[PDB]
Design a protein around this motif. Structure first.
Motif, PDB file in Angstrom:
ATOM      1  N   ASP A   1      23.029  10.538   0.794  1.00  0.00           N
ATOM      2  CA  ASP A   1      23.054  10.683  -0.654  1.00  0.00           C
ATOM      3  C   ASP A   1      24.331  10.181  -1.297  1.00  0.00           C
ATOM      4  O   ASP A   1      24.528  10.440  -2.485  1.00  0.00           O
ATOM      5  N   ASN A   2      25.183   9.462  -0.573  1.00  0.00           N
ATOM      6  CA  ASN A   2      26.408   8.903  -1.138  1.00  0.00           C
ATOM      7  C   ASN A   2      27.255   9.969  -1.823  1.00  0.00           C
ATOM      8  O   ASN A   2      27.832   9.746  -2.888  1.00  0.00           O
ATOM      9  N   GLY A   3      27.320  11.148  -1.212  1.00  0.00           N
ATOM     10  CA  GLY A   3      28.089  12.251  -1.740  1.00  0.00           C
ATOM     11  C   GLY A   3      27.422  13.067  -2.821  1.00  0.00           C
ATOM     12  O   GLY A   3      27.982  14.090  -3.227  1.00  0.00           O
TER      13      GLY A   3
ATOM     14  N   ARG B   1      23.048  17.004  -4.709  1.00  0.00           N
ATOM     15  CA  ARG B   1      21.612  17.139  -4.877  1.00  0.00           C
ATOM     16  C   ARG B   1      21.029  15.758  -5.113  1.00  0.00           C
ATOM     17  O   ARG B   1      21.618  14.943  -5.827  1.00  0.00           O
ATOM     18  N   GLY B   2      19.873  15.505  -4.519  1.00  0.00           N
ATOM     19  CA  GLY B   2      19.363  14.158  -4.414  1.00  0.00           C
ATOM     20  C   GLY B   2      18.158  14.128  -3.499  1.00  0.00           C
ATOM     21  O   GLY B   2      17.560  15.160  -3.196  1.00  0.00           O
ATOM     22  N   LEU B   3      17.789  12.911  -3.106  1.00  0.00           N
ATOM     23  CA  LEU B   3      16.594  12.719  -2.296  1.00  0.00           C
ATOM     24  C   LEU B   3      16.767  13.293  -0.899  1.00  0.00           C
ATOM     25  O   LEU B   3      15.896  14.011  -0.397  1.00  0.00           O
ATOM     26  N   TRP B   4      17.877  12.972  -0.254  1.00  0.00           N
ATOM     27  CA  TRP B   4      18.091  13.355   1.126  1.00  0.00           C
ATOM     28  C   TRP B   4      18.483  14.802   1.298  1.00  0.00           C
ATOM     29  O   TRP B   4      18.230  15.382   2.354  1.00  0.00           O
TER      30      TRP B   4
ATOM     31  N   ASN C   1       7.068   9.685   7.392  1.00  0.00           N
ATOM     32  CA  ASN C   1       7.806  10.915   7.122  1.00  0.00           C
ATOM     33  C   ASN C   1       8.024  11.748   8.370  1.00  0.00           C
ATOM     34  O   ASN C   1       9.005  12.491   8.443  1.00  0.00           O
ATOM     35  N   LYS C   2       7.112  11.686   9.337  1.00  0.00           N
ATOM     36  CA  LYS C   2       7.398  12.275  10.639  1.00  0.00           C
ATOM     37  C   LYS C   2       8.650  11.677  11.247  1.00  0.00           C
ATOM     38  O   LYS C   2       9.480  12.398  11.801  1.00  0.00           O
TER      39      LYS C   2
ATOM     40  N   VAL D   1      12.921   5.485   2.440  1.00  0.00           N
ATOM     41  CA  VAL D   1      12.316   6.806   2.466  1.00  0.00           C
ATOM     42  C   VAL D   1      12.014   7.139   1.013  1.00  0.00           C
ATOM     43  O   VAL D   1      12.681   6.629   0.114  1.00  0.00           O
ATOM     44  N   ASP D   2      11.250   8.211   0.733  1.00  0.00           N
ATOM     45  CA  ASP D   2      11.220   8.844  -0.603  1.00  0.00           C
ATOM     46  C   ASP D   2      11.382  10.343  -0.487  1.00  0.00           C
ATOM     47  O   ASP D   2      11.741  10.858   0.576  1.00  0.00           O
TER      48      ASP D   2
END
Lengths: 506, 769, 186
Positions: B60-62, B65-68, B170-171, B221-222
């Protein structure tokens, strides 16, 4: 989220024992710290406190800068340390093992081994190696100055580890320092952390790009030679020789050693003698512990922690090893030698490095017989025949003495004017050491132990301007290489303290 | 997807702490039910979670909160206790269940019975603060921490309950994260930052391949898919219930500790001493829900799963009747004497009685002449923390730590599934072996994904139905389970006249209170149950009634009591939510009819040589032997007679025989004894001593010391005879004693000789002081 | 605190066993003689949390109890006319406080008169068979003579004494209670 880390730094290298080392464990001083495998190791708690302790002396006890690296359980903003210090197994070199230092307190009145003051200490031998096992989590895009200063101090050998730091032990030096950077803020750095073993930093760049700052200290390096044979006694008699020099393992070799315990104690004795003379104070009635408690010596040499007047010495003395070294089996050949003119002569020829010259061998290590003569008959009082292997031509490395000026300041509460009576005593003791008034080791009234002092190098780092004249190399024994205005300056503060021999330390 | 494991290899000495010391110890490690060190699954999830959050921050580049980071809340579940404000989505549970990491089962089998070795797995580490001024050990900051020995390989069972529609990409993301977060873990436990707890954590079947795929793919990914509950389904096609009932016994064995919330009160959860029937409902759905509409049976009352209570006499233990009373000073069921059934016995002359409360009783019969066997459930308090991630420590003691009571592992419980013949015929028609499908290992209760909840379920042969005696003189009622009754306003209630009315209606009789004064007629206690409803997503309504053990006895005022109807009530239960085991009732039980005042109660494996943990076992053995040798040496050396016996050296008034320089000389030789192969150096030295009179005469005033030294060094057995340690409690490796004796011989000899010389010189100085 | 109080109830019920042991001479019926007593527990992590489990965990064998409870608080002078006077002295709290003092005391070095390493070895020994426990006690008391004061058999060779057919010891109570006699009234 976890703790936010900008860059993780893996900071690694080899810490080498520059003196022997003792880190104690729960299970007199013969228990060394052992991990669960029973291998000798440096606990990361003990290494951290050495490193954290140094930085605390560096930063004038600026607690905030310390707690920003080392953590704090109290401050709501802080918590865990950003430095991780791992445990490091000690690699004692081949053909070496733990040694035991045996010693004794000397009664100041009688000049003899004080009853009840024998001690034994087990020590990891010199030249033993263990990993520098540091990780630093950076929360900003750099590397902290105090941490760069710490690594410079480790490479300088400035940090002491373990017990008996003032009395022979604890010196370590860092080599092979590597810094690996992982930009855990970024995908390339996290996958580098998982896969690629990190971005290399050339330490030589950063080490050049900032000035190394030590806390105040005065190094004293004494170049000396035995004027008469100087040895510490080995605790065991040999077979051919009764009284043998103490040796110690130094890397893969053995060297003759004068423990810094021995040099410390003779210097402490002379300090205490000078003060008690100036006060005309008698230590005949007092017990050994009472005989040691005296003003200015309790700070330069320390006081025992008895419930507290305990203090560590501001003055620390290294184990001094001979420039001569031997293979371990070469010295065992001497120890095992059964006949002084038999198998001892091969063994001594080998150990001194003169296998084909018994003359040159015995100019280094000379066997000496001593006989007591009966007064009434003039006969050898047989049974009072004993033999000494006198190291008449053993060359020695310079005695390294370290005065922790920062330690003295804490004792005197920062005011450097109080330093001058302590510095004065230390110079008066070095004047006696240079004038052959302080013999060292065994048999000092029995033909051994007088030393020549060729040179005293005084090497102050970050000294205050008024003590800056101490940065000197002396070759007059009477210290006339020190500026007379400075020696008169010291002499005046000394004479003032003599008038009221109060306890500086308030 | 259970069958994944994590292996942890401990690479430095390690300390999963308990937050406290004990006695002389300032910190002690957590020990499992076998008294062995382990990593609790709550500790293991926390460390692994924290590292996947380290990976997420990088990806998440720091961005915190975010996707990862959402992928961590997908894999590890949300952290709702930290979120504040109007969070609308239901909290996601974890996809990953991580067990506790235990030592290999063969290694733990070796430790059984060997309490000395069980302690020897850990050793004391000193810690002391140094005064920054005086540089001295700051007294009363001296500290001893128990740490476990490095080399431990611990393994945890992992279950990934991935969504069944989860995309194959996603697995790979989940596998990639977990592999990546496992890899980045370097430390766990107490004093991580000072070199404790260095480890490798590896999943089985996750490698750098799973890491490399994410590195190759993470940019495409999403967000993970949205969480939804598995909903119930109903057909309604069950047959109408027909007698007989079948009673299928279920034996529950606890495999981990199990938390069964009695009351949740701030940061502590108290635990029941039984398993409520509602915890087995998900197992009933999973195993049998294909054979009949389970939900329909529950709604109709065609299913009962009883509470699982401690097994006594081979049967379900029965909650101690509150009509039993102990003599307050000297009696009660715990003391096995002075137990009065106050339904039948007057209170004794001059002796005050305490009512019985907790525990369970075994079977009893009218003329047993022994008190019923009691059962006890062992519970322990487990304590946990949350780490505040910026400071990496708990945010205070008050709101940083929490505790669970749990029923500990190794305990056995019996439940009963009761089904009418209607459903049993249907089930048997679809599967004749259906009782074979009741054997399962399931996780139940609170925190079941972590170190809690693992139970084995086993099905027994169909039990006989209860056969209460129909007596027309009295009705006796024993609450085997909490009874929930509606008041006549359908609130829950605590009025026993309503239970009186309920029974006499249910049995079609009339009841009257037992009118004697020296006896008690009624012994109820109130019970309030504060559960959740996981499918609701919300708390269950509070259920009030009477706790198990509550007793009452009535005179029958009119009407015959039908033994067939008493049997049916003893099957189905009375009141509300009997399907999940409330309302279970014992009629006319002989234990409530007895007079009891006169009765009393009735009166390792060696590790295979090729085994992979033999290197770690040998580590614990050497530690245990070394400490035994050193302690026994220091005992021996403390006595003048034994020092003379072993080495011949003696003190004669004030001078030592021989002089200490002869002892120092020998001691400087013996330190070269690294192995039995070096022994000729030691016996060589002795030859040169006795070769010459001047040396020989110094030892000749000893008790034969030079022969005694030669014997101790030349005879491999003699050191072990002097030490006289029984090493059987200190060994677990096959052929361990012989290997350890040969390995430790030179050290043991050196240890003993050094101890004797030290003890000699200590007394020698004491004679001179 | 719910659970802690439930235990304090069971501890006072244990403390009240003085009512059976210490009694007014020639009383008919037998009457308890005024004797104060304490029972306590310190809830260490794996110690149990209910009274019966706590005490069961302290019975490493069915012949052995690693507790000597309750502790009588009444002065030995005020009990001398009671039945069970000799019992009250075996259960006197002063006997525990002495043993705690010995554990806390220091040698002339300012090191503890019993080290933690040896205290911990004795904790371990107490869970062994009595002959192994007594063997360990012999070895350690040869080396650290202050442990003679912790002997209980009177033969000066066991930490256990026989009591109602059980071997019981005060030593584990002293190790646990070591830090819980703080006072501040000197």
């Amino acid at each position: 989220m976890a703790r936010k880390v900008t860059t993780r730094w893996k900071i690694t290298g080899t810490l080498i024992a520059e003196t022997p080392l003792h880190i104690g464990g729960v299970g007199t001083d013969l228990a060394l710290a052992v991990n669960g495998a029973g291998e000798y190791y440096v606990p990361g708690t003990s290494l951290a406190g050495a490193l954290r302790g140094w930085m605390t002396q560096l930063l004038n006890n600026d607690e905030s800068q310390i707690k920003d690296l080392w953590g704090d359980h109290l401050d709501a903003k802080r918590g865990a340390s950003f430095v991780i210090v791992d445990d490091a197994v000690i690699h004692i070199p081949n053909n070496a093992d733990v040694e035991i230092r045996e010693g004794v307190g000397i009664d100041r009145h009688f000049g003899t081994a004080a009853n009840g003051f024998k001690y034994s200490r087990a020590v990891i031998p010199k030249g033993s190696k263990f990993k520098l096992p540091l990780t630093f989590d950076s929360q900003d895009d750099g590397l902290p100055n105090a941490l760069i200063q710490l690594l410079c101090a480790l490479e300088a050998g400035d940090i002491r580890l373990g017990a008996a730091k003032t009395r022979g032990l604890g010196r370590i030096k860092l080599d092979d320092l590597k810094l690996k950077s992982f930009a855990l803020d970024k995908p390339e750095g996290i996958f580098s952390a998982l896969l690629d073993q990190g971005k290399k930093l050339d330490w030589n760049q950063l080490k050049a790009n900032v000035t190394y700052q030590s806390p105040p200290y005065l190094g004293i390096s004494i170049t000396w030679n035995p004027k008469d044979p100087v040895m510490v006694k080995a605790e065991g008699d040999g077979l051919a020789i009764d009284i043998l020099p103490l040796v110690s393992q130094v890397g893969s070799d053995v060297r003759f050693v004068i423990p810094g315990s021995s040099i410390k104690g003779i210097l402490r004795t002379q300090a205490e003698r000078i003060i008690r003379t100036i006060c005309q104070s008698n230590g005949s009635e007092k017990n050994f512990l009472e005989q040691l408690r005296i003003n200015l010596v309790n700070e330069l040499f320390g006081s025992a922690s008895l419930s507290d007047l305990g203090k560590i010495g501001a003055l620390a003395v290294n184990d001094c090893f001979s420039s001569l070294s031997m293979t371990p089996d070469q010295w065992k050949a001497v120890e095992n030698a059964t006949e002084m003119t038999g198998n001892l002569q091969p063994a001594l020829k080998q150990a001194t490095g003169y296998p084909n010259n018994i003359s040159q061998a015995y100019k280094v290590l000379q066997p000496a017989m001593h006989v007591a003569v009966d007064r009434w008959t003039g006969g050898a009082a047989e049974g009072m025949l004993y033999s000494v292997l006198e190291p008449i031509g053993v060359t020695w490395e310079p005695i390294q003495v370290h005065l922790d000026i920062a330690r003295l300041k804490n004792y005197y509460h920062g005011k450097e004017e109080k330093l001058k009576p302590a510095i004065a005593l230390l110079l008066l003791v070095l004047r006696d050491l240079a004038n052959k008034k302080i013999p060292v080791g065994y048999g000092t009234n029995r033909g051994m132990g007088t030393i020549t002092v060729s040179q005293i190098t005084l090497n102050g780092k970050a000294l205050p301007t008024e003590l800056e004249p101490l940065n000197k190399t002396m070759t007059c024994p009477n210290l006339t290489d020190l500026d007379e205005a400075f020696r008169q300056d010291l002499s005046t503060a000394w004479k003032e303290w003599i008038a009221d021999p109060i306890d500086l330390c308030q | 997807m259970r069958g994944i494991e994590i292996t942890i290899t401990m690479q430095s000495d390690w300390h999963v702490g308990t937050g406290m010391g004990r006695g002389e110890l300032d910190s002690v490690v957590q020990r499992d039910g076998d008294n062995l060190p382990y990593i609790p699954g709550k500790t293991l999830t926390g460390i692994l979670r924290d590292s996947c959050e380290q990976v997420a921050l990088g990806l998440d580049n720091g961005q915190t909160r975010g996707l990862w980071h959402g992928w961590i809340n997908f894999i590890f579940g949300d952290q709702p206790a930290l979120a504040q404000g109007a969070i609308e989505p239901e909290p996601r549970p974890a996809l990953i269940a991580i067990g506790s990491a235990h030592l290999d089962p063969k290694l733990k089998a070796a430790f059984q019975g060997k309490k000395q070795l069980q302690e020897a797995i850990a050793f004391m580490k000193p810690g002391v603060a140094i005064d920054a001024i005086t540089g001295t050990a700051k007294k009363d900051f001296l500290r001893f921490e128990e740490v476990v020995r490095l080399g431990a390989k611990l393994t945890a069972e992992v279950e990934l309950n991935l969504p069944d529609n989860l995309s194959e990409t996603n697995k790979k993301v989940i596998a990639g994260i977990l592999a990546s977060g496992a890899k980045l873990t370097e430390r766990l436990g107490g004093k991580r930052r000072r070199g404790n707890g260095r480890c490798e954590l590896k999943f089985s079947g996750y490698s750098d391949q799973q890491i490399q795929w994410l590195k190759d793919n993470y940019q495409s990914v999403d967000q993970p898919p949205k969480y939804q509950q598995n909903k119930l389904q109903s057909a309604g096609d069950n047959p109408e219930q027909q007698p007989p009932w079948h009673i299928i016994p279920l034996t529950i064995k606890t495999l981990s500790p199990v938390v069964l919330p009695a009351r949740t009160v701030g940061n502590v959860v108290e635990c029941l001493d039984y398993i409520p029937g509602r915890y087995l409902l998900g197992y009933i759905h999973k195993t049998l829900g294909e054979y009949f509409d389970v939900s329909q049976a529950i709604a109709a009352g065609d299913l009962i799963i009883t509470n699982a209570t401690i097994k006594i006499d081979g049967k379900a233990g029965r909650a101690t009747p509150f009509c039993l009373f102990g003599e307050k000073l000297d009696g009660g069921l715990g003391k096995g004497k002075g137990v009065y059934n106050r339904f039948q016995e007057s209170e004794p002359d001059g002796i005050q009685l305490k009512g019985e409360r907790g525990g369970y009783v075994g079977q009893f019969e009218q003329e047993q002449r022994n008190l019923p066997n009691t059962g006890k459930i062992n519970s322990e308090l487990f304590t946990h923390n949350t780490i505040q991630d910026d400071v990496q420590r708990p945010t205070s003691d008050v709101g940083g730590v929490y505790s669970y009571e749990a029923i500990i592992a190794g305990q056995t419980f019996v439940a009963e599934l009761r089904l009418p013949d209607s459903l049993v015929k249907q089930i048997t028609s679809k599967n004749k072996n259906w009782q074979a499908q009741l054997k399962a290992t399931i996780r139940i209760g609170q925190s079941k994904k972590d170190q809690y909840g693992k139970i084995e379920v086993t099905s027994g042969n169909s039990a006989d139905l209860p056969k209460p005696t129909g007596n027309n003189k009295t009705l006796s009622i024993w609450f085997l389970s909490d009874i929930l009754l509606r008041g006549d306003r359908l609130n829950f209630n605590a009025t026993p006249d309503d239970l009186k009315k309920y029974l006499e209606n249910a049995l079609d009789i009339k009841l009257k209170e037992r009118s004697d004064n020296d006896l008690i007629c009624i012994a109820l206690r109130s019970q309030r149950t504060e559960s959740w409803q996981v499918r609701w997503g919300l708390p269950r309504p509070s259920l009030v009634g009477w706790q198990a053990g509550s007793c009452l006895i009535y005179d029958i005022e009119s009407g015959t009591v039908n033994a067939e109807k008493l049997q049916e009530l003893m099957i189905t239960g009375i009141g509300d939510r009997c399907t999940e085991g409330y309302g279970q009732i014992g009629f006319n039980d002989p234990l409530l009819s007895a007079s009891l005042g006169k009765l009393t109660a009735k009166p390792s494996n060696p590790l295979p040589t090729n085994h992979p943990t033999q290197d770690y076992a040998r580590l614990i053995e050497k530690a245990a032997w070394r400490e035994a040798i050193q302690n026994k040496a220091l005992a021996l050396a403390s006595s003048r007679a034994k020092r003379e016996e072993i080495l011949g050296i003696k003190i004669m008034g004030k001078d030592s025989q021989p002089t200490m320089t002869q002892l120092g000389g020998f001691r400087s030789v013996l330190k070269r004894l690294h192995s039995r192969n070096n022994r000729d150096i030691v016996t060589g030295y002795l030859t040169a001593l006795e070769q010459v009179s001047n040396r020989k005469e110094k030892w000749s005033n000893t008790s034969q010391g030079l022969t005694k030294i030669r014997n101790l060094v030349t005879q491999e057995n003699l050191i072990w005879n002097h030490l006289d340690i029984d090493f059987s409690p200190l060994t677990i490796t096959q052929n361990g004693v012989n290997q350890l004796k040969s390995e430790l011989w030179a050290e043991a000899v050196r240890t003993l000789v050094d101890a004797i010389i030290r003890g000699h010189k200590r007394d020698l100085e004491k004679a001179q002081e | 605190f719910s659970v802690a109080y439930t235990l304090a109830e069971r501890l006072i019920k244990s403390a009240k066993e003085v009512k059976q042991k210490v009694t007014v001479t020639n009383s008919s019926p037998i009457t308890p003689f005024p004797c104060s007593a304490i029972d306590f527990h310190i809830l260490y992590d794996s110690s149990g949390i209910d009274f019966d489990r706590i005490r069961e965990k302290l019975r490493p064998e069915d012949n052995t109890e690693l507790y000597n409870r309750p502790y009588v608080v009444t002065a030995a002078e005020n009990l001398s006319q009671a039945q069970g006077y000799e019992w009250s002295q075996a259960h006197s709290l002063q006997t525990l406080a002495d043993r705690v003092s010995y554990l806390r005391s220091e040698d002339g070095e300012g090191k503890s008169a019993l080290p933690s390493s040896q205290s911990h070895a004795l904790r371990t020994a107490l869970y062994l068979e009595k002959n192994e426990a007594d063997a360990q006690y012999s070895l350690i008391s040869q080396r650290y003579k202050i442990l003679k004061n912790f002997a209980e058999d009177g033969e000066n060779k066991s930490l256990f004494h026989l009591e109602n057919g059980k071997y019981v010891t005060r030593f584990l109570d002293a190790l646990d209670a070591k830090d819980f006699f703080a006072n501040a009234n000197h």
